[PDB]
Amino acid sequence: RRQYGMGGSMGPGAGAPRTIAETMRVAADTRKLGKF
């Protein structure tokens, strides 16, 4: 159960966290969905 709790902590633990044209082209889909 401790190991499973460690995995459950890791999940959101990882969930919580070039050229500028590429920098914004990589996040365009995220911006569109979030703005919807």
């Binding site: 499973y4 709790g5 995995g7 459950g8 999940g11 959101p12």
Partner: peptide, 24 residues
Amino acid sequence: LVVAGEALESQLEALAGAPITLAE
């Protein structure tokens, strides 16, 4: 007609929460 996603993180929460005690 919706298609929806079920987050598996809920299942991880269920796994992390266990009664154990004398039962287990």
